[PDB]
Nucleic acid binder design. Structure first.
Ligand SMILES: [K+]
Ligand SMILES: [K+]
Ligand SMILES: [Mg+2]
Ligand SMILES: [Mg+2]
Ligand SMILES: [Mg+2]
Length: 66
RNA sequence: AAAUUAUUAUAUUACAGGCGUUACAUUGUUGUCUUUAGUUCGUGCUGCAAAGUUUUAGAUUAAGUUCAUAAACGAACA
């Protein structure tokens, strides 16, 4: 919340990054400006299926998240 | 403009007809049982590879009954 980031506390689905289109394509994306405010522009179906890859991954328990 | 064509009857010959054979040559239908949370496809992942996809020989119910879970995640039909 304080970094405007994302988190996963329940389970890492194997393939979330390598098989992203079969796992995360259905979920909604949004466009934001430099102030992190939603632009409200409707997204083309092309832009809503593209993989959205994290720029940085922080892992609290790496021994259980190989 | 008497020949043509229609119908009908008769005749003619290819045949028609056959509960004749063959359900073990067939269409279709039906009887009986059984498997029917199972197949294939897509992507991902493991193994040099043929292959495998792993927890799990999960829990629960009279029973897929209901639920949980795993490097797997979906889709499609059963
Ligand atoms: K017979
Ligand atoms: K496969
Ligand atoms: Mg005959
Ligand atoms: Mg007879
Ligand atoms: Mg290989």
């Amino acid at each position: 919340k304080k970094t405007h980031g994302y988190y996963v506390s329940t389970r890492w689905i194997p393939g979330t990054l390598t098989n992203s289109t079969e796992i995360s394509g259905i979920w909604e994306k949004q466009e934001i400006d430099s102030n992190d405010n939603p632009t409200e522009r409707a997204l083309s179906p092309n832009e809503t299926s593209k993989q959205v890859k994290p720029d940085l991954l922080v892992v609290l328990n790496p021994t259980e998240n190989r």
